[PDB]
């Protein structure tokens, strides 16, 4: 894992996150791609940004943590772009994805738990 891919989830929190991602795909509460993710942030509709630690060169993602801090949106890195893209429901790598808001789903409540876990990593 690239040391700039911080905070970084373990394999267990990773599976949890990817499960939430796959729920979001099914609910159509998911945007894939770094620029697609940026756009959700600037609209104020992201609930969670997930990035891949094995994105090379990782520099192309590094504006995203800063944007998320500006917008008060949680983010995390998972170790593998291949696994992230599987979770997103596509057969290609995904280096960043964004869960978007929906007031009638359980996603926000799961993200709240995930945030607590990420904060325990810190």
């Amino acid at each position: 894992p690239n040391p700039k891919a911080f905070p970084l989830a373990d394999a267990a929190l990773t599976q949890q996150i990817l499960d939430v991602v796959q729920q979001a795909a099914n609910l159509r509460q998911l945007k894939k791609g770094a620029n697609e993710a940026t756009k959700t942030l600037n609209r104020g509709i992201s609930e969670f940004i997930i990035m891949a630690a094995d994105c090379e060169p990782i520099e192309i993602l590094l504006h995203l943590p800063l944007l998320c801090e500006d917008k008060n949106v949680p983010y995390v890195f998972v170790p593998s772009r291949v696994a992230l893209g599987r979770a997103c429901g596509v057969s290609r790598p995904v280096i960043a994805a964004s869960i978007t808001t929906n007031d009638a789903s359980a996603i926000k409540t799961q993200i709240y738990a995930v945030k607590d876990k990420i904060e325990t990593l810190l």
């Binding site: 700039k4 008060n72 709240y112």
Partner: peptide, 27 residues
């Protein structure tokens, strides 16, 4: 390398202040 250690440190501080469920307590 020292660049990356500082990046991590600053990311930690800003996650606690700007994003955390318990950010008031971290503030």
């Amino acid at each position: 390398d020292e660049d990356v250690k500082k990046w991590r440190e600053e990311r930690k501080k800003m996650w606690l202040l700007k994003i955390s469920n318990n950010k008031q307590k971290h503030m």
